[PDB]
Amino acid sequence: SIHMEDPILTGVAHDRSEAKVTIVGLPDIPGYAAKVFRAVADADVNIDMVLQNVDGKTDITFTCSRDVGPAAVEKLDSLRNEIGFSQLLYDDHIGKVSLIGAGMRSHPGVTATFCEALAAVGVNIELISTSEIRISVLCRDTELDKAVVALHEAFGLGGDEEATVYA
């Protein structure tokens, strides 16, 4: 489409078949995080919403599609000695809702308006990731439909044959 000084919003996406994985109690020593990502690449699972958070320990979280969810954690567990973790967390009752677009990163107001919209329909955010081209949140599947609606409303979308330049 239009593929400027204001952000372009091309749509609202949603995926109901999502899994959330947390590796708990990772040594904060160089090498260990890399093993986590190598294991996932070796197992051929495309991951998203990835983050690291803090003992001398750290946790890593990501999502992936449910269908490969169990394959992910198995691979991960098969390397419990080499990766130093104490626990693997798993949540397959969540879905991802997203604002797609471009140039979103210089306008933090978009993210705030994104969240204000979900809050207004009492949607709870479990994870959030943002980029130039996507703002995604992870929530329970029971709330995906009201989230999509709220987003469409808040941003004047749409078709989605519509795109918008939002101010």
User: Which residue numbers belong to the known binding site?
Assistant: 28, 46-48, 52, 110-111, 124-125, 131-132
Is residue 160 within 8 Å of residue 11, measured between CB atoms?
A: yes
Contacts of 15 (CB under 8 A, 6+ apart): 65, 95, 96
88 binds a copy of itself (CB under 8 A): no
**End-to-end CA separation in angstroms for the chain:** 18
Which stretch, 79-87, 91-99, 100-108, 158-166, contacts a copy of itself (CB under 8 A)?
A: 100-108
Closest CA to 70 of 12, 19, 7, 132: 19
Which amino acid belongs to residue 66? R
115 binds a copy of itself (CB under 8 A): yes
Judged by CB under 8 A, the residue of 66, 130, 146, 148 near a copy of itself is: 130
Alpha-helix runs per DSSP H in 83-143: 108-120
Which amino acid belongs to residue 26? L
Using DSSP, state whether 101 is helix, strand or coil.
strand
24 binds a copy of itself (CB under 8 A): no
When the beta carbons of 70 and 108 are compared against a copy of itself, the nearer one is 108
Q: Which residues are annotated as a binding site for substrate?
A: 28, 46-48, 52, 110-111, 124-125, 131-132
Is residue 103 within 8 Å of residue 8, measured between CB atoms?
A: yes
8 binds a copy of itself (CB under 8 A): no
61 binds a copy of itself (CB under 8 A): yes
Instruction: Give me the residues that bind a copy of itself (CB under 8 A), please.
Output: 28, 30-31, 33-34, 37-38, 40-41, 45-48, 50-53, 59, 61, 105-109, 111-112, 115-116, 118-119, 122-134
